[PDB]
Amino acid sequence: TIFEERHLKYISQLGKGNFGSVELCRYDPLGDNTGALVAVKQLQHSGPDQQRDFQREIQILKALHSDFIVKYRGVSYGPGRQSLRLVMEYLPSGCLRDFLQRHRARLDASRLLLYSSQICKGMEYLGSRRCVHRDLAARNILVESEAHVKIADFGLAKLLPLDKDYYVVREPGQSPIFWYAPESLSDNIFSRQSDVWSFGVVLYELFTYCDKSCSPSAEFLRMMGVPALSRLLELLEEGQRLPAPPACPAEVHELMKLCWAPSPQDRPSFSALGPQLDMLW
Ligand SMILES: *C(=N)N1CC(F)(F)Oc2ccc(-c3ncnc4[nH]cc(CCOC)c34)cc21
Fold first, then answer.
1. Can you tell me the distance from the alpha carbon of 73 to that of 141, in angstroms, rounded to the nearest whole number?
2. Nearest CA owner, ligand 1 atom 14
3. Which CATH number fits domain 1-90: 3.40.50.10860, 3.40.50.970, 3.30.200.20, 3.60.110.10?
4. Does 70 contact ligand 1 (Cβ within 6 A)?
5. Ligand 1 center to residue 135 CA distance, Å?
């Protein structure tokens, strides 16, 4: 629950992003290099709202207990009472994005659908706890094992007040626009309904095995052509969508098309999506 910085022997960097970073540390009090491995998140440079946003990320993940959400192990303190580091479980297989590229000859559509089912189930749970992820993408999903995935990175995640079912953000979204729904693009509105849209892009990502050539960014920019955001909005408002991934089963592509309904209230819920994905196995 509380990790001492003196017993957290740093190994490598696991990745960087959103004013902070994740480090592969070893929690070994004995100082012998024989202890458990943990994923440790800090901010590379602290800020005003940055420290508050990180503090909220910790609260959110502390309160999330699902087989499809990366486990919170605790915190490591410095000043009183600023929670300097966030300690999570270490999933050696890392990102689904990189795992997909590395193992695509081994992973069939059955396995891709299992992943989808698990990502969906975890999003069902988030929605149940009034949590908008706001940054669902294959880069933000982790691999526990060959048949197990968990949703990670809650750095942009928000909690819906009980009176409101949508959330309007002020600061522009510094994440690739290719995952945002039109209402996020145009009016900075985020919901479980926008997370569903971003899930369709995750299904796209899965069935393209995160190929860089037909990636959401690569393929939309190719379709585009004015500011880039405006060009994307025009495209999607005309009803233009990402093409069917090569060799993708039609039923899956149809589910992507569904997640990509222009209006948020026409998109299926994760509760509704889940058994549909289970039908495909
Ligand atoms: C995936 N290969 N990466 C690269 C990246 F996206 F830049 O950043 C990452 C940070 C951390 C991990 C990660 N790897 C292993 N165990 C983990 N537990 C929690 C996290 C955080 C996920 O942050 C996106 C990890 C992977 C990547």
1. 18
2. 94
3. 3.30.200.20
4. yes
5. 14
